[PDB]
């Protein structure tokens, strides 16, 4: 009964209450002197969760990127598909850029000088820009899977998926059956890893509690004001994202944003109460029908936009990786911000899980910048963001629905009219 009502509780509320209980118990046991007994007894339960997330982050990238890039490729795209894919990738790039802008205009990380024992996180040296653009393509894909290097894995997985779906319409028979078997095996690997993501994110409140308790027991690092600042940064970034980006796009394409934003306000209210973008898929199909565009174009666009087009998750990734970069002392270069943009855009092309996928994609961005999520400073600054993930997730799901609704509207306009 107790175990069933613990599992039946939602994941994000339990992670937030685990963060709150971790902060309270860590402050109480840090004031009363018992801090080493918190460390040597509670830090394994908060490091096992980081080890499990670092286990899950690498086989998701290859499999989910192969499946997603095989459902994106120009061999399965007409004249609507190329325009909607170009819109989704460019709008995700604008979302990451606006998240980085709202993270540089604010300062969410400055204030928490994070250190585990006493030592500051020493950053690596950054290569030049041409070395990054030449390091995107791997010299060996298996040796880029066995190491870290999320961006060569992303590039090789996109290339492999597009080559498989080019082979899928070949005139042979054994070639087509072999390509179909390979794509079915890789899709089975991705669907097998999503269940382990569900299990690890069900374990997640104990790990977040066990990490936040140790961090509060070390110092009184004053994290409540900085987490309120990064929450305000995410909300102001999402509101300005909706307003500026979508109003500029609708004013370019001539369609009036007032009645569109009324119908989209109904859809946003539904998607903001239910906090799920896949749940309002008949709701946003109803709104797209009430705009009166074409039945085939929204019945083709809205599942693709619900499983691939993620704007609020990308903006959350930008602001979160910039908060983790500033809460440790390591500034980011221009190549690191281009790496953020590329990894967030190309990792929001295949990844769609019901829980946890934002946390795994933030792990991808962190391991692709250089913060490897094995030092306890990166794990602490990531656990605080994973705690705030609920009150970021509501607004980011609302922007995730607004993005594909705006894309459906403007692509149907330029295609029909």
What are the DSSP calls for 169-193, one per residue?
Answer: T-S-SHHHHHHHHHHHHHHHHHHHH
Element housing 395 (H / E):
helix 376-416
- Two tokens, residue 411: 């692509």
Query: How many Å apart are CA 3 and CA 116, to the nearest integer?
Result: 33
Task: Give φ, ψ of 308 to 5 degrees.
Answer: -125, -50
| Distance separating alpha carbons of residues 185 and 174, to the nearest angstrom | 16
For residue 62, the tally of other CB atoms under 10 A from its CB is 24
d(CA 118, CA 318): 28
Q: Are 291 and 409 in contact (CB under 8 A)?
A: yes
Three-class secondary structure of residue 248 per DSSP: helix
Residues preceding chain discontinuities in the chain with C to N over 2.5 Å:
none
Sequence-distant contacts of 278-284: CB under 8 A, at least 24 apart: 278/306, 278/307, 278/354, 280/401, 281/306, 284/401, 284/404, 284/405
Query: Is residue 65 a contact partner of residue 350, using CB atoms and an 8 Å limit?
Result: yes
Contacts of 148 (CB under 8 A, 6+ apart): 58, 367, 372
Contact 61, 153 (CB under 8 A): yes
Whole-angstrom distance, CA of residue 46 vs CA of residue 25: 14
Task: Please report which residue ranges of 219-256 form alpha helices under DSSP H.
Answer: 223-240, 247-252
Question: CA nearest 323: which of 399, 239, 315, 241?
Answer: 315
Q: Cα separation of 153 and 149, whole Å?
A: 7
- Report all structural domains of the chain as residue ranges with CATH numbers, in order of start: 1-416 (1.10.3860.10)
Q: Where are the alpha helices (DSSP H) in 247-311?
A: 247-252, 257-274, 281-291, 295-307
Asked whether the beta carbons of 42 and 214 are under 8 A apart, the reply is yes
Q: How far apart are CA 27 and CA 134, in angstroms?
A: 47
Q: Characterize 76-95 residue by residue with b for buried, 16 or more Cβ atoms within 10 angstroms of its Cβ, and e for exposed.
A: eeeebbebbbebbbebbebb
Burial class, 278, CB count within 10 angstroms (exposed 0-12 / middle 13-18 / buried 19+): middle
* Interatomic CA distance for residues 63 and 19, integer angstroms: 32
* Whole-number Å distance between alpha carbons of 117 and 374: 14
């Amino acid at each position: 009964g107790l175990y069933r009502k613990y599992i039946e509780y939602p994941v994000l509320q339990k992670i937030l209450i685990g963060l709150i209980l971790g902060a309270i118990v860590g402050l109480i046991l840090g004031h009363y002197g018992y801090a080493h007994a918190v460390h040597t007894y509670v830090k394994p339960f908060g490091d096992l969760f980081v080890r499990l997330l670092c286990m899950l982050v690498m086989p998701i990238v290859f499999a989910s990127l192969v499946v997603g890039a095989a459902s994106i490729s120009p061999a399965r795209l007409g004249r609507v598909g190329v325009k909607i894919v170009v819109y989704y990738l460019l709008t995700s790039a604008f979302a990451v850029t606006l998240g980085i802008i709202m993270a540089r205009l604010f300062n969410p990380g400055a204030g928490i000088h994070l250190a585990v024992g006493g030592q500051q996180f020493q950053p690596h040296q950054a290569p030049p820009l041409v070395h990054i653009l030449l390091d995107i393509v791997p010299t060996n894909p298996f040796g880029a899977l066995a190491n870290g290097q999320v961006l060569p894995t992303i590039f090789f997985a996109i290339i492999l998926g597009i080559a498989i779906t080019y082979l899928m319409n070949s005139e042979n028979e054994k070639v087509r059956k072999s390509a179909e078997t390979l794509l079915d095996a890789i899709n089975g690997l991705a669907e097998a890893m999503y269940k382990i993501v569900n299990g690890v994110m069900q374990y997640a409140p104990i790990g977040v509690f066990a990490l936040i308790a140790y961090v509060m027991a070390e110092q009184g690092v004053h994290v409540v004001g900085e987490l309120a600042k990064v929450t305000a940064a995410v909300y102001v970034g999402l509101t300005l994202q909706i307003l500026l980006v979508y109003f500029v796009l609708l004013k370019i394409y001539g369609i009036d944003p007032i009645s569109f934003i009324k119908h989209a306000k109904d859809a946003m209210l539904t998607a903001f109460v239910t906090r799920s973008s896949s749940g309002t898929l008949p709701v946003t199909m109803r709104v797209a029908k009430e705009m009166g565009i074409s039945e085939g174009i929204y019945s083709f666009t809205l599942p693709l936009g619900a499983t691939i087009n993620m704007d609020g998750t990308a903006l959350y990734q930008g602001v979160a990786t910039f908060f983790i970069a500033n809460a440790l002392g390591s500034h980011l270069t221009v190549g690191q911000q281009l790496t953020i943009v590329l990894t967030a855009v190309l990792a929001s092309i295949g990844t769609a899980g019901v829980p946890g996928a934002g946390a795994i994609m933030l792990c991808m961005v962190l391991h692709s910048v250089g913060l490897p999520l094995t030092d306890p400073n990166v794990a602490a600054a990531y656990a605080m963001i994973l705690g705030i993930d609920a009150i970021l997730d509501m607004g980011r799901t609302m922007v995730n629905v607004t993005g594909d609704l705006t894309g459906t509207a403007i692509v149907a306009k330029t295609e029909g009219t």
